[PDB]
Write a protein that binds this ligand. Structure first.
Ligand SMILES: [Cl-]
Ligand SMILES: [Cl-]
Ligand SMILES: [Cl-]
Ligand SMILES: [Cl-]
Ligand SMILES: [Cl-]
Length: 124
């Protein structure tokens, strides 16, 4: 299958650009990370920082996750993040996304040994 840590990398990491391309950034990334294979993933966030900086969030501020679990952590600093969300024109197999880029704190759930990100909970 895919491990939880590897799925978090594929779905949420983009260390190759400092910030969302243009308005088409999300259409391109949602497709290349295979998030539009059988259906259009409705919402997905990409973090534009090194993998090491995102992994380090797991030893930063411990905060509750939205679902009540207590293994979430909020980055001490803001990070460049792009939220990708389907627009009304989106309809599989022609997915379409709005791209919203901003500098926000990343909140991730962590698990395992090594203790690394396994879910993206929110940005603030
Ligand atoms: Cl892995
Ligand atoms: Cl892999
Ligand atoms: Cl894949
Ligand atoms: Cl997300
Ligand atoms: Cl996730």
């Amino acid at each position: 299958k895919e491990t939880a840590a590897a799925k978090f990398e594929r779905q949420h990491m983009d260390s190759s650009t400092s910030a969302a391309s243009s308005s088409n950034y999300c259409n391109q990334m949602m497709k290349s990370r295979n998030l539009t294979k059988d259906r259009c993933k409705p919402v997905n966030t990409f973090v534009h920082e090194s993998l090491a900086d995102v992994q380090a969030v797991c030893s930063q501020k411990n905060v509750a996750c939205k679902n009540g679990q207590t293994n979430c952590y909020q980055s001490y600093s803001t990070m460049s993040i792009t939220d990708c969300r389907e627009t009304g024109s989106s309809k599989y197999p022609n997915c379409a996304y709005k791209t919203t880029q901003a500098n926000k704190h990343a909140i991730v759930a962590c698990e395992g040994n090594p203790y690394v990100p396994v879910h993206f909970d929110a940005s603030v």
